């Protein structure tokens, strides 16, 4: 998994910044941990998206 | 639930080939409105007189 980027996407994809590549790192649990600064670009809030 | 289905048939796994195949001969039939149709056949095969083209 090291240095193998993944594309993250959130519908609706309003502008071209709604698809962004990150590098991954294994995290215990079953929820994707998003960085708290890209949430403006995705327009994501953490109430169940 | 998932409900798998199949059109009745099979998929075989012989890797394809293109050099040794039993040999064939070509017949030619002629319909009523002057058309010509070429049909391959095996060599050990009785070539019939009439064919539904």
């Amino acid at each position: 998994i090291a240095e193998h980027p993944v594309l993250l996407n959130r519908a609706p994809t309003l502008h071209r910044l709604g698809i962004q590549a990150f590098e991954p790192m294994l995290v215990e649990g079953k929820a994707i941990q998003l960085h708290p600064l890209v949430c403006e670009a995705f327009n994501a809030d953490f109430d169940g998206d | 639930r998932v409900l798998r289905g199949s059109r009745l048939g099979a998929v075989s796994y012989e890797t394809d080939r293109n050099h040794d195949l039993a040999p064939r001969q070509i017949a030619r039939y002629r319909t009523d409105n002057g058309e010509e149709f070429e049909v391959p056949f095996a060599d050990d095969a009785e070539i019939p007189g009439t064919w539904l083209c």
Partner: protein, 99 residues
């Protein structure tokens, strides 16, 4: 120009199809309103699923079962009329009805 259409695309032209073009694509005339058998669940002859016209249901086997291997390919079984070939050409051969 390229009926197999494998990676060489320069244009793609549309147009009206004359009746000489429809009986040139086709591999035979379907003349019965039958789809499939009710007992043997095999496609009937000269119907909407007929092997003879559209292709073999099983890979490299004819209808009667006389030819069943890849050593015979391209040939047509003289007793049933089904060309022994792959079996996924049933999703690409056409057929026509004469009005």
């Amino acid at each position: 120009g390229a009926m197999l259409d494998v990676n060489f695309f320069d244009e793609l032209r549309i147009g009206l199809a004359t009746a000489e073009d429809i009986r040139q694509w086709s591999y035979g005339e379907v003349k019965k309103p039958e789809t499939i058998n009710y007992r043997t669940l095999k496609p009937e002859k000269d119907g909407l699923f007929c092997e003879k016209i559209f292709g073999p249901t099983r890979d490299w086997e004819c209808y009667c079962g006389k030819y069943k291997r890849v050593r015979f390919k391209g040939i047509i079984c003289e007793r049933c009329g089904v060309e022994v070939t792959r079996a996924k050409v049933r999703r690409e051969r056409m057929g026509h009805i004469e009005l």
